[PDB]
Design a protein around this ligand. Sequence first.
Ligand SMILES: N[C@@H](Cc1ccc(O)cc1)C(=O)O
Ligand SMILES: N[C@@H](Cc1ccc(O)cc1)C(=O)O
Lengths: 438, 437
Amino acid sequence: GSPYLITGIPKDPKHPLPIRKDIDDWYLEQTSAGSNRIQLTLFVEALTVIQNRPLNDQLSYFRLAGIHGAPWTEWDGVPGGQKDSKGNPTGFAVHNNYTFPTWHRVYVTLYEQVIYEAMLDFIKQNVPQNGKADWENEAKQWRLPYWDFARFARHGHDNDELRLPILVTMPMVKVLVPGQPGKQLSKPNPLYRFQMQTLMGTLERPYAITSQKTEEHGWSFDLPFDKCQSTTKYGLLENYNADVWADGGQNWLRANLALNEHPWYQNLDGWDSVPTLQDMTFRLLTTGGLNWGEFSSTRYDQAPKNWMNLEAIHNNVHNWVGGFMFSRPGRHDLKLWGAGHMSSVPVAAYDPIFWLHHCNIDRLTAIWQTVNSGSWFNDDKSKVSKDDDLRPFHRFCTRKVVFFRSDDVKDWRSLNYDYAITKDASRIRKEISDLYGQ
Amino acid sequence: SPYLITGIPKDPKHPLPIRKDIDDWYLEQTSAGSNRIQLTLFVEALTVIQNRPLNDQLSYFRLAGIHGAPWTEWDGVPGGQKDSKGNPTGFAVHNNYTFPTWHRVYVTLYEQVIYEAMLDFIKQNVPQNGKADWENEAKQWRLPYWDFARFARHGTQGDELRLPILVTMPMVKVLVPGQPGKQLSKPNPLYRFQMQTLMGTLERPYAITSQKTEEHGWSFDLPFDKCQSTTKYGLLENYNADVWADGGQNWLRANLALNEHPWYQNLDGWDSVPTLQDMTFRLLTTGGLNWGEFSSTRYDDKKNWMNLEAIHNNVHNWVGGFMFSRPGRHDLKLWGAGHMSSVPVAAYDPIFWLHHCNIDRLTAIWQTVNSGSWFNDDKSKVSKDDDLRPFHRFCEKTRKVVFFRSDDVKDWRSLNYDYAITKDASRIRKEISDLYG
Ligand SMILES: N[C@@H](Cc1ccc(O)cc1)C(=O)O
Ligand SMILES: N[C@@H](Cc1ccc(O)cc1)C(=O)O
């Protein structure tokens, strides 16, 4: 029940600071002969359970994704129905403020924690007694993988492309049947998409997902998210029959094309060059002399040239994954036509890739902190936001339950996870160059 | 065996029913009320056909298998055929003047099997009070065609050629026959076809192998053995094979290719580089052509028009995806390979049949406005009496079982279907211009 305290996965002394791994490396390991495949099985089975929980269960997938934006309801006893300065419905998520990274740090941890708890439930109910200890130890080693949107994907060893995760592009995934070596079962992949049993605009009150406004070429459109049963990447196009919109597909080739063509939304007039997504990410991590406000948010901003802040890169990756053009564009942009959930703040968190993208945004924040350790909400602009309550997330302090604040998560290790790149801090500048340097 | 192909049987209350444009038909079914009986029949019948086992020669897999891989027997007619490269090949005719007539019979086989499965479905699922109405809809149904050269409608004249609406929907809503008012969402059997295992591991002799293809002068083995599902564009070199198991229905990329029309033929010296619509217009309206020139790439055996088979070859490539290996950066937007671009496995994708239904329609249109042009030029006359194996029919005169021959299907109405555009010869030239000019 409530309040639901967010702590990260509990500490076990024989599992010191387990790491959140690159989801492609993790998937390739899990599906190799030298792995027991238990973590993949647990993630798939737990996330499937979470997705199938009912709407009145605040730890259902729908309700956890609902924290971020639409349908703008309460969560954990904290009221929804909030409004923007524009007068428009808004959710709990922070955007365009210096608490963007820290709000999302807690959010990603909540998701990881709920998954872990569901893994433990799965083990109790499905694993032979003599195997539970082994399966429990795998749950305790597991952490939410990140999608490294700036790292070139692996392409074999006998022959330079950014890609959506392997596992995100698979409609089905094979998992273990506990206690039955050699037998796998192919199941719908809960990372491929999220769908409800009806169009999301018809869910029981107060949960219905509405259409969402967007502006394209100086014109307002309604992105028809109310007419979707499933999340989609690029599958919503104007003047297509609404039965296509019900499930417009996971058009991952178009997402990959966008990641590698990097159509930045910003005006890059006077820039020395147009950086790729990997080079922009490299510059984020290596440009010296920046304060926390400049790194963290679009709020700080006439803007700097030849590098981009964390939130601005994140914004572009969202558009490129989900699809950002509903109406038919000009001839040269037809190759990227189509709209989908990840491009729209009110509904992006319904696409399971949301959490993997935000896991890497958390990683980029941790890396930047590591090489800029004296820069934390302590310039004239960002200092005012430092003690904002990160609603709706509760923690125990006092002997009182209170809202999270940014200082509580400055050290991400207090939430009992780490990243390989930040664990080995001595190698960090070399690793940044190896991964993202041109 | 033998399975005697007739077309859907003649019913005096149903004179020459028409094969409709599948997008018009989909809207007729869904858009002005829930007039969904034919849609339900087609979905339920094709689902039954796709779930039949390999030992049933009227299963989807075995019917698609007639065309190409895995190159086995069908209807008591042996496999073991070789193509011009000395490789294993199927019964399908390509690069000969019987290309249109072989495929005319093949599409009719598919339609007839579906109709027969519709009748079984009605017997088993429709209550007495509904039988007349459902039987009437089945007897009216014919296989819809995909008009790849007509702009998709908006709700209004469109601007874009597109895959059929229904082909791009993973799920489809159908009627519950005994329960008027109730409907159910089911997997759409037109969206894709898949087996229960990777197709490369099916029992002998049905396993689908990889298929060697040339790209930019070099050989590649398209990994169709590693697919469980058919795909449009989802097979890319140096992707993990777990992706290849089901590479998706990447219909946006197919639509992009249809509208960019990257012809594989060298059009050096042409007046212009036509769009798909205009190339189709030219096919139907260029005067003074003979059957050999219209029907096949064999005639020229390589001016400002392209023959039926050459257009069909490009559309197959554009729907299925024709680049497995990664191209240069300027062409990345169309990277990816899939079943419809590959003769050995194209028939597994359910759009194959809708495409070939339109190829049949284009042949019927051309025949209508080129009366007398039929296997009678110096080149195509030798092929006129080829047996169209493996297709059997009952010859009523000798009361014998024989293979189909091209002259048996010169009049497509003898197979008891027609096309709206070919009903009135006074109207056809105007309609060609209205649709494609
Ligand atoms: N569409 C936003 C980017 C964005 C999308 C979804 C998000 O959750 C966050 C940011 C933009 O163009 O700025
Ligand atoms: N790939 C063939 C075209 C084709 C593909 C499949 C077919 O079934 C028929 C033709 C070509 O490029 O010529």
